[PDB]
Structures are given as C-alpha cells and as structure tokens.
Amino acid sequence: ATCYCRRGRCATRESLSGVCRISGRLYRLCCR
Amino acid sequence: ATCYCRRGRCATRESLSGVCRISGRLYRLCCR
C-alpha cells in the first residue's frame, strides 16, 4: 500500500485506515 | 488492521505494508 497523511478527507479511491502523528499533530491515514 | 507510520523500522510484531507520504516526508507503513 501507499498511504497519504491528510488533514482533509481521504481521496475518492482511498480508505481511512488509521491516523498519523507528525510534528505532534494528527493526520488521517488514507490508503489505497 | 492497526497501522502506524514510522520513522524507523516496523516493530517486530508489525509487517511492512508500504509507505506513508506527505509533502516533504516519507515513512514506513507498519501494520498488525
């Protein structure tokens, strides 16, 4: 898989698969 | 599965399942 750490909702083909924390801040983990 | 984006190796109890990407950074995607 390749996932993207996003602050906005996941892309249309992505699934929310968890969270990332980067510089203290949570991001959506969006995977395909 | 519970997945984490890691700067180092995946935990012994996790599997390398891909990468996590944001602008400027790459991480291992590590899943259980």
UniProtKB/Swiss-Prot annotation, chains A, B:
Outcome of swapping residue 32 to A: Impairs antimicrobial activity against E.coli, E.aerogenes, S.aureus and B.cereus. Reduced induction of IL-8 secretion
Effect noted on mutating residue 9 to A: Reduced killing of S.aureus and E.coli. Impairs antimicrobial activity against E.coli, E.aerogenes, S.aureus and B.cereus. Reduced induction of IL-8 secretion
Effect of mutating residue 5 to S: Prohibits tetramer formation
Record annotation: effect of changing residue 9 to K: Impairs antimicrobial activity against S. aureus. Reduced induction of IL-8 secretion
Mutation effect (residue 13 to K): Does not impair antimicrobial activity against E.coli, E.aerogenes, S.aureus and B.cereus. Reduced induction of IL-8 secretion
Annotated phenotype, changing residue 28 to A: Does not disrupt homodimer-formation. Reduced enhancement of S.flexneri infection. Impairs antimicrobial activity against E.coli, E.aerogenes, S.aureus and B.cereus. Reduced induction of IL-8 secretion
Disulfide bonds: 3-31, 5-20, 10-30
Effect annotated for changing residue 28 to K: Impairs antimicrobial activity against S. aureus. Reduced induction of IL-8 secretion
Name this polypeptide is given: HD5(63-94)
Organism of provenance: Homo sapiens
Residues of the full protein shown: 63 to 94 of 94
